[PDB]
Amino acid sequence: AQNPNCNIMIFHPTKEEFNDFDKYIAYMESQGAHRAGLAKIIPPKEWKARETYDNISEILIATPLQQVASGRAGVFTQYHKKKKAMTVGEYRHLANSKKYQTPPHQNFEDLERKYWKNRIYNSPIYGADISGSLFDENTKQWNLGHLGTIQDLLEKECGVVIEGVNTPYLYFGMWKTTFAWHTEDMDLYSINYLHLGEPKTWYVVPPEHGQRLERLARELFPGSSRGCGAFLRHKVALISPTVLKENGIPFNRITQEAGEFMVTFPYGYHAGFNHGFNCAEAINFATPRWIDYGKMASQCSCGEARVTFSMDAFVRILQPERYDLWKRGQD
Numbered sequence: 001a002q003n004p005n006c007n008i009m010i011f012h013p014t015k016e017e018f019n020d021f022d023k024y025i026a027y028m029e030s031q032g033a034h035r036a037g038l039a040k041i042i043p044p045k046e047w048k049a050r051e052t053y054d055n056i057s058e059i060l061i062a063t064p065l066q067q068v069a070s071g072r073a074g075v076f077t078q079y080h081k082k083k084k085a086m087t088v089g090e091y092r093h094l095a096n097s098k099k100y101q102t103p104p105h106q107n108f109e110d111l112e113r114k115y116w117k118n119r120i121y122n123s124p125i126y127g128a129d130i131s132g133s134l135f136d137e138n139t140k141q142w143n144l145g146h147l148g149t150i151q152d153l154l155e156k157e158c159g160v161v162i163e164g165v166n167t168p169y170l171y172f173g174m175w176k177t178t179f180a181w182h183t184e185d186m187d188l189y190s191i192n193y194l195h196l197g198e199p200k201t202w203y204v205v206p207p208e209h210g211q212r213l214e215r216l217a218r219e220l221f222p223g224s225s226r227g228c229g230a231f232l233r234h235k236v237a238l239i240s241p242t243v244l245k246e247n248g249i250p251f252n253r254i255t256q257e258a259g260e261f262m263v264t265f266p267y268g269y270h271a272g273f274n275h276g277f278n279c280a281e282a283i284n285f286a287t288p289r290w291i292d293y294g295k296m297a298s299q300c301s302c303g304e305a306r307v308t309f310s311m312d313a314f315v316r317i318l319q320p321e322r323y324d325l326w327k328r329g330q331d
């Protein structure tokens, strides 16, 4: 078995290897990459996502989210308070302000220490989940707006034609903006490209150990667990590396820099934080190997998780027994 310790693997495809996206994902899996839950892909030196980032300031962040924490430094939840609209240029100025800017630090490990010590005492503002793309239309390789759709994959594997669409999302971050512990909708893959700015640190639990993280989370968030049998679908709970180590949960960490892709694999729990002003693009995708994960994915039916239009068909076809309860949660 390849990669039996479930380490995060880093790949350096050549320009020739960068042509066929599906084939390269399958290659990475042949080397055991998926066992970690997360992989990094450094694009060939010849590749670029677009020519420059000099003209993005007028993108609108219609609903910036202030991420307010509750709990203790290593075990906390966050809620999202909606703020007034602002442009990307206005958000960048805010990120760079004395109130929100990255503090002085020695290296990524020192900044990580400071994050976990101090995150809860601040409320950073995240421009998350903005439909759109920064890839040039002429970028033919690893263009996250031109990937094969999940609906087409389901139809190719299973024969059933379904409604729905699959488009990318932009994320504008600042110091301490936080992504809570989660797997993707329907335990899909994700791919994330860091277009510009400061890094993003990731934590990940191997898919084969995801239930260990779930059991810890039920212990640490006992009211939330009574409320919902899949409350990590709410995407609000944080647990630090120190607390994971104290509880014997297997995990890994890695820092993504501008110009790099990360892939999350089915049922790979992940969480993380941004180092400073940045912009990322991400989308969900599927492969043949996903189908079995999609059939077994947990679901939130309490009403909190509320998701896209296109998840309806995935539940309806892959999980017909669960469909009626889940749809009630949507309505």
Ligand SMILES: O=C(O)CNC(=O)C(=O)O
Pocket (backbone or CB within 6 Å): 171, 178, 179, 190, 191, 192, 200, 264, 270, 280, 282, 283
């Ligand atoms: O970058 C972020 O805030 C969160 N991204 C992801 O969870 C992802 O790409 O799967």
Ligand SMILES: [Mg+2]
Pocket (backbone or CB within 6 Å): 055, 056, 057, 058, 059
């Ligand atoms: Mg613009």
Ligand code: NI
Pocket (backbone or CB within 6 Å): 182, 183, 184, 190, 264, 270
């Ligand atoms: Ni994710």
Ligand SMILES: [Zn+2]
Pocket (backbone or CB within 6 Å): 227, 228, 229, 230, 231, 233, 234, 300, 301, 302, 303, 304, 305
């Ligand atoms: Zn729920």
